[PDB]
Structure 1
């Protein structure tokens, strides 16, 4: 609880779309190596032997993402063999868990400088490719009453009273703020364009974005998790636990849910001595982290107790946080989070979110963390809180302070 952990760099690739995406031809190992080489470009005299570990989140560590992709990135990029490399999977919060684990490894005093982030090429390795101890075990699947994240989001909208127009209004809000952030140049220094082995450009923007989105177009979209609940019977299973609810209002579509995209993110985290030894300017400080959870089946109410726990841990309140960043897995989860904690609208996902730019599962946590490092510096604000809902029913939150 002694060594303060600092963020020195936080970069990410652009997010390529699922259908006819620009990054579909790019191996997820190449997405990480490109970010490693960018860190070298910004700090050429850095002694990489001081880097003691590389922690990458990855929700589907199979195929191109199997065999400890973090260690593969270490060996492929020519980093020292002493730099380790570990893959971890905590569903949607894997990217932020890698950052938090790196920060906690620094706080323990037994690691000095760590790379953290995530990688997910969902166009090459789709969600569910890794099978699953739950889905292959009907005896347990039957008992825990497994219900996909999507039905829980519709259930949250049903319970909280969020209409189809309410969630589509937030989706339009995310598209507008993501376009304003790209036009204003907020992402110019942290989105590292992907290039091939000849230096040719592959992708330099978040191509899932639809900046010309309208209230009228969103209302025409069909609810996307309606045939999932009918053919799978997940509606009836959800209402067996939530027996006071009669019918689930299916409001979520492809336009108000997170996008299926490819991408990676890297964060350099180390102690103050590590920054001074290598001449690195600290950009922010990891104030506190927290892991919690809430009701399963609903699956997505986990970020509420995790935020209160990280605020209680840092001795802060909602009023002390300048920027709130919650992953836009589904619009109703953000609206529930905003309603529970009374988050001011001007502070919540101010540069857009996964509805506009995409949700590359294993990398999203580190992407939205780096987004808040940039926005605190741009606004000259002080504190930001970053959190993500998780599958199974858990949550992860992190507080950072600009330095």
Structure 2
């Protein structure tokens, strides 16, 4: 009759590649399979035919990630054909949704042993073309699915607008009064902290390599590619806003478009013991929230509020906060709404998506796993991961180290 505790066990990720960069040759399905293969190699006591489900986040699903990439990935990874899979889409929150969905399946007693993760290959996102609506139609057109609006509904544009994600971040900067200077400082600190974590070997502990064929032999992609460790305030101040001279968001204070995949095991207490797993954290809960599309970046606020209210935990009780850095403007605006200092030590202690990049489907799984990793290294207890969502949402997920 009682709900069951749920533990995150092993977790692992590919490096994050730049658009057109180190991972651009790797099909989304094959990329998604890389962390799955590593889970298999890294957890040899598991009876693999007992995995109840693979849940994977993926925002696109038009490309080599089409037709339920979770199931494609598990087959490519060498998991038995008897294992089910399902793909979740809450845009940039998809991979976190995977984790929280997996958690709810175990908490409710419907499953014992599951994998949750996320993939996105933005390099390889395809073009789409709608069907002709009439014989001999002269209005055929291609649209890029890399990021952002396509097949725009005129009713959506008239009621809510179809602001680009950078536009929404400018709207957040405007409405919440987040200065260019503050955004650049945040971005700088993101780059510094990530450069420090990379030199410390922190990212290395999370990463499994991806092997790439060249003409004369193979290389290994080993390192997060997006980082700009040489970033300075002077460098950031010189950049032009994406949307015009009177705006504040720049490529230097924004996440990038990127490729990568991540996955982790979740299990009941019985499953941990049966499969020889090492339990690392208990999942406390997940909540979602909605906001106006035009200020989508503030979405984390109702999400975090809803979760912490229900669990009865103060925002200030968390020993780590992984706040997604879609843009410095909205990162800062969320922190301020929540009463957390712009530079508080527990937020993004190893940097975030400004430095690391953000393959939509992967980023939510990455935030959960890195929060856990951070809690282990620092000896912290509770961790909060939260991110915003295109078209105006937030997602939040809380964990507690065992």
- Normalising by structure 2, we get a TM-score of 0.90
Counterpart of 2:392 in structure 1 is 393
Q: Distance in 2 between matches of 1:206 and 1:132?
A: 24
Cα distance change, pair 287–169 in 1 and its aligned pair in 2 (3 A): same
Write the deviation string for residues 145-183 of structure 1: whole angstroms up to 9, x where unpaired: 232221121111122222211111111000000011111
2:319 to 299, 322, 332: 322
Give unmatched runs, 5+ long, in structure 2. Answer: 128-143
Larger mean Cα displacement after TM superposition, 52-61 or 336-345 = 336-345
Counterpart of 1:381 in structure 2 is 380
Q: Distance in 2 between matches of 1:137 and 1:157?
A: 26
1:267 to 260, 264, 268: 264
1:193 to 184, 192, 209: 209
**Aligned 1:58-97 pairs, distance under 5 A:** 58-97=58-97
Offset at 1:342? Answer: 1.8
1:2 match: secondary structure: coil
Q: Distance in 2 between matches of 1:169 and 1:275?
A: 43
**Aligned 1:244-263 pairs, distance under 5 A:** 249-263=246-260
Counterpart of 1:231 in structure 2 is none
Larger mean Cα displacement after TM superposition, 191-200 or 368-377 = 191-200
Cα distance change, pair 224–374 in 1 and its aligned pair in 2 (3 A): same
Counterpart of 1:17 in structure 2 is 18
Q: Distance in 1 between matches of 2:209 and 2:118?
A: 17
Q: Distance in 1 between matches of 2:71 and 2:194?
A: 33
Q: Distance in 2 between matches of 1:356 and 1:319?
A: 25
Counterpart of 2:240 in structure 1 is 222
Offset at 1:92? Answer: 0.9
2:23 match: secondary structure: coil
List structure 1 runs of 4+ shifted beyond 6 angstroms: 130-134
Q: Distance in 1 between matches of 2:186 and 2:359?
A: 20
2:277 to 277, 280, 293: 280
2:376 match: secondary structure: helix
Answer yes or no: is the 8 Å Cα contact 1:275–1:282 preserved in 2. Answer: yes
Counterpart of 1:367 in structure 2 is 366
Offset at 1:71? Answer: 0.8
Number of aligned residue pairs: 381
Q: Distance in 2 between matches of 1:141 and 1:267?
A: 38
Larger mean Cα displacement after TM superposition, 139-148 or 159-168 = 139-148
Counterpart of 1:106 in structure 2 is 106
Answer yes or no: is the 8 Å Cα contact 1:52–1:82 preserved in 2. Answer: no
**Aligned 1:326-345 pairs, distance under 5 A:** 326-344=323-341, 345=344
Q: Distance in 2 between matches of 1:126 and 1:14?
A: 22
- Normalising by structure 1, we get a TM-score of 0.90
The alignment yields a C-alpha RMSD, in angstroms, of 2.0
Counterpart of 2:136 in structure 1 is none
Answer yes or no: is the 8 Å Cα contact 2:93–2:361 preserved in 1. Answer: yes
Offset at 1:337? Answer: 1.3
1:188 match: secondary structure: helix
Counterpart of 2:167 in structure 1 is 151
Structure 1 residue 213 and structure 2 residue 231: aligned?
yes
Q: Distance in 1 between matches of 2:203 and 2:53?
A: 27
Cα distance change, pair 131–176 in 1 and its aligned pair in 2 (3 A): closer
Structure 1 residue 176 and structure 2 residue 173: aligned?
no
Cα distance change, pair 275–266 in 1 and its aligned pair in 2 (3 A): same
Counterpart of 1:235 in structure 2 is none
